[PDB]
Amino acid sequence: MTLELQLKHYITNLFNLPKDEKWECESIEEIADDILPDQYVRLGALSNKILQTYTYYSDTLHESNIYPFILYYQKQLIAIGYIDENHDMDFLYLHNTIMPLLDQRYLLTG
Amino acid sequence: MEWSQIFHDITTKHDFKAMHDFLEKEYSTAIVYPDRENIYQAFDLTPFENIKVVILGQDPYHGPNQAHGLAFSVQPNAKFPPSLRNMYKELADDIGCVRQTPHLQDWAREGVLLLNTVLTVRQGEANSHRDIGWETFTDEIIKAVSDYKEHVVFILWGKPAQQKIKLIDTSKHCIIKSVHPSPLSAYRGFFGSKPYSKANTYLESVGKSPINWCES
Numbered sequence: 001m002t003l004e005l006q007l008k009h010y011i012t013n014l015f016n017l018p019k020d021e022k023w024e025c026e027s028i029e030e031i032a033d034d035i036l037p038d039q040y041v042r043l044g045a046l047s048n049k050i051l052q053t054y055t056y057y058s059d060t061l062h063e064s065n066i067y068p069f070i071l072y073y074q075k076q077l078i079a080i081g082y083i084d085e086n087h088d089m090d091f092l093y094l095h096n097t098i099m100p101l102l103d104q105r106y107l108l109t110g
Numbered sequence: 111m112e113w114s115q116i117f118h119d120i121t122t123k124h125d126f127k128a129m130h131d132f133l134e135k136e137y138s139t140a141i142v143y144p145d146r147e148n149i150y151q152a153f154d155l156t157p158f159e160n161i162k163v164v165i166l167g168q169d170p171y172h173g174p175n176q177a178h179g180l181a182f183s184v185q186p187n188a189k190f191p192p193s194l195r196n197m198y199k200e201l202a203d204d205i206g207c208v209r210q211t212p213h214l215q216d217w218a219r220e221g222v223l224l225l226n227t228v229l230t231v232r233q234g235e236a237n238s239h240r241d242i243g244w245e246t247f248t249d250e251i252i253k254a255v256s257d258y259k260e261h262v263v264f265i266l267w268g269k270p271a272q273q274k275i276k277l278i279d280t281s282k283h284c285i286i287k288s289v290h291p292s293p294l295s296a297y298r299g300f301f302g303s304k305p306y307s308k309a310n311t312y313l314e315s316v317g318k319s320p321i322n323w324c325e326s
Contacts, residue, residue: 024173026191026292027236031269034295050269052236053294055192067192067293083293 003070004056006108007080010092011061011068023056023068035071036079037089045096049073073097080105111258113153120250129243133230141233143170144177151179152225155218162221163263163309163321164255166271169239172231181224183214196291196300204304207324216326225251227270252277259283261316263309267291267300284312 004025012019030053032046041047054070061067064085071079080093094102136142144151167181171191176184182194190198190212198209218224227248232238255262256278264283266272268290278285288303289295310320 024176024189024191025234026193027169027172028193028290028292028294029168029237029268029270030290030292030295034269034289034298053292054236055292055294057189057192059189062190062195069294087293087297 001110003077003080003108004054006110007056007068007070009110010108011066011082015060015064015066017058017060017064021058021060023058023061026055026057028053028055032073032078040094040096040101042096045098046073046078049097051078080108111158113158116158116251116254116258119254120247123250124243124246126243126247132242136230136232136239142239143172143231143233144179148177148179149229152181152218152223155180155215156221156223158255158258160221161223161255161259161262162313162318163265164223164225164252165265166252166267166274167224167226168268168270169228169237170226170231172233172236172238174233177231179229180214180218181226183217183224184212186211186213188212192293193291196293196296200291200301200303201306201323203301204306205323209325211325217321217323220321220323220326222321223255227274249274249277256283261313261318263312265305265309268295284309286312 008023029050032049032051033041035051035053036046052072056068066085067083069081069083076097078095079091081089081091084090091102092104092107137146165181170177171184176188178185182197184191194212202208214224225248228239228244230239252274262283264278264285266274266285266287272287275285286305286308289299291300306323313320
């Protein structure tokens, strides 16, 4: 099962969303310093790194005011989570290219 | 000065045969967006002589019935991408008007060149056509706009677009730049940045009429 689909099962169950609603995906590159909380953006780790960004969207996702996201730096997974209704980032996974910082990927086991 | 003349210059200076051979095979064996006949739609809708504002995008949307050859725009019945939703929120706060269509062919008719830096993508695979020659092409397009037009606004959202600053003559042209409108970055300086009225104020300072950004 793909990461996107694990994320979808997790979010739809957590937020009680329709399972057969289509999730579309927007991919954008942006510097880590403008995406992540400051405490997680540090010289020699994520600072000044361009991330490849996947943000998922649908009508019931917009109604719940959340944005599920997956972040990469080239081939290395950097983050999995969702921006919640307060516009805070909520992580299931976070790696800074040196070590894993947060890892609740067991939540994606389906 | 016409796109056909500029394209001729570009295709003479660089050899794109391997790109076209790669794309021929991609459109035969895979699902590539946008539809082939739409690849140059930004050029078809904004003739060179008409450009007043250049907005740089990255890759085309990579899902079904989304991309149609314009940066940021999706097809009239498609859902709102997160970045476009944010662009329209800033638009409502800056200019005042509310757009409900996600289609930007009207902006393109107004003189907004909606140029992605890469013009094709395989379905579901972000960046899948990075480095096949589009960047060479599209870097040359930005240069050409800078070189041959008198006074254009370049709007550069996100770090990748801002890497094109070195191709733009700022003694001639106006650069407006900020973090990307994606909800991942938008609160770090996209909201409140007023790119639309800033663009129009510059156009008026230089004796050009403003862009009508409202539904037209």
